[PDB]
Design a protein around this ligand. Structure first.
Ligand SMILES: O=C(Cc1cc(Cl)ccn1)Nc1cncc2ccccc12
Ligand SMILES: O=C(Cc1cc(Cl)ccn1)Nc1cncc2ccccc12
Lengths: 304, 304
């Protein structure tokens, strides 16, 4: 029992972290097989970041200008290429610690673990969700760029995020491992609208099921609702509309607790309309949306 | 910017995890150098757990009864001994992945990362605090015993906790790496009083400084207080009394923000007396006490 904001064990990803330096800029890179992946803004100076012409900037750089260090040893760069907002530095040595991996583009509302790094050295690991507006509410400082987000299924690491930027609002933006930004963001030092965010309804419902599994049951009521009635409440409280696909993903949690999905929706409706009344659920005084239904079952069943 | 419940990267600890089986019981062990450390209740059957005579139970066991597996390879046990509530299984092979390590007994109110494991395989990592009453509010299922808590300083892992038991209340109890329980607990299946817990005042103050650093400032007020006046409030709200030693540990955060410790105490006093009024601080609707002053500076400065 107990429910924590649990991250995947980071060891497999720690073995892939390297430092990448170009000119006077240093950030993190991800070394998989014979390629190091890093944000393309490593080629910029502070004067370039206002509106960089990355193609022109990269043309002034040669393989020997990209300094890649894995711990204390230097990697030899034999090729470089820009793919969207990432650079791919081909090196002459395959990373001996390359785990089984995939590059995936996650959907908004899904979760992943972040291994925050500075100078190619891991500093910490935390779990977070990709917001519906494609930002992440991470914890990152200058030099964290190139830190990655991932999920792990047995021995396979699915990399889903590479950190690129902190928006003036203090929220974070980044790309998939092919260098495509999540959301409307561009790698420039300019104010950029993130757009209206919403609460991940399916995740709040999953977390309410996790609370019932772990003994926090005070919020259960004698009511039920419909998807239509619940979605009117969701609209008013800036929650994502619940669909049958979300109800289907909540199936296993519903069977475990014997609480029909629409009955749990009625509990969520009452919490939205009345608040918590100074009470807590799983050590929180707000409705938590950073746990997917898969996360709840994995944590409540013990997948390794 | 951003503030997360960040755990240490778990790689160095992942390399130490093994599975230990004795009879029909399997749990986790920690393999450091040529010794595997695990909870002594691995020698018990369910009939023994009501009140085990561990000395008698261990006398029936020989080196060959302790099955230790590191991934897919079997370790040869050449010695066994009980130290308090842990068994130390001497093996013929030093763990090649043994990091630089220390065994430390942490104080209540301090934090550490937990690498939750099942069958010697890591499942997840989370950060938590040792409660003032010596329990931990972890996330653990059957078979998690032997999972460890630790801190990392550059390349040295300081192991501070080994998971042993879930109390009937759903909270967790365990030992230091010499097998001494934190708190009054005994390794038996019996209801055991944990005793009155308190909120870790110095950690709440540290987290309020983290909020100011990250832009959440609505709770700052035009008031100040004294240690005496603040401690009357702390008494009423079941908070640990603040001492000059705690004020001294808050020094660096106080100098960073320019907010005197007693001025922040006045903000904490007002939050305790008035609540949050439906507002949040660093994504929380309650006062968070699982971040020490060291944690806040490490996260807000980027130590790797
Ligand atoms: O955002 C940037 C640099 C950069 C990259 C791009 Cl692609 C566009 C503009 N500027 N760096 C940072 C990332 N994450 C947290 C940071 C906290 C403080 C300072 C800097 C941080
Ligand atoms: O507590 C025990 C077993 C045990 C050990 C001792 Cl030392 C005394 C009594 N019983 N195991 C568990 C530990 N952590 C979370 C668990 C969640 C569910 C079931 C079992 C869990």
């Amino acid at each position: 029992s107990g429910f924590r904001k649990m991250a995947f064990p980071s060891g497999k990803v720690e073995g892939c972290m390297v430092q990448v330096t170009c000119g006077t800029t240093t950030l993190n890179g991800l070394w998989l097989d014979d390629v190091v992946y890093c944000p393309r803004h490593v080629i910029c100076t502070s004067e370039d970041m206002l509106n960089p012409n990355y193609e022109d900037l990269l043309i002034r750089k040669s393989n020997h200008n990209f300094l890649v260090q894995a711990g204390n040893v230097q990697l030899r760069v034999i090729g470089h290429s820009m793919q969207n907002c990432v650079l791919k530095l081909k090196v002459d040595t395959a990373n001996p610690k390359t785990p089984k991996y995939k590059f995936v583009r996650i959907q908004p509302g899904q979760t992943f673990s972040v291994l925050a790094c500075y100078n190619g050295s891991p500093s910490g690991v935390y779990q977070c969700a990709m917001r519906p507006n494609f930002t992440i509410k991470g914890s990152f400082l200058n030099g964290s760029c190139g830190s990655v987000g991932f999920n792990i299924d047995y021995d396979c690491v699915s990399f889903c995020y590479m950190h690129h930027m902190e928006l003036p609002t203090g929220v974070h933006a980044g790309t998939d491992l092919e260098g495509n930004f999540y959301g409307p963001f561009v790698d420039r030092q300019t104010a950029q609208a993130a757009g209206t965010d919403t609460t991940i309804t399916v995740n709040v419902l999953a977390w309410l099921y996790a609370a019932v599994i772990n003994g926090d049951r005070w919020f259960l009521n004698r009511f039920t609702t419909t998807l239509n009635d619940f979605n009117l409440v969701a609209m008013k409280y800036n929650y994502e509309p619940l669909t049958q696909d979300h109800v289907d993903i909540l199936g296993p949690l519903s069977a475990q607790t014997g609480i029909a999905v629409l009955d749990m929706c009625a509990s969520l409706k009452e919490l939205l309309q009345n608040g918590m009344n100074g009470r807590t659920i799983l050590g929180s005084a707000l409705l938590e949306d950073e746990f997917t239904p898969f996360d709840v079952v994995r944590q409540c069943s013990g997948v390794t």
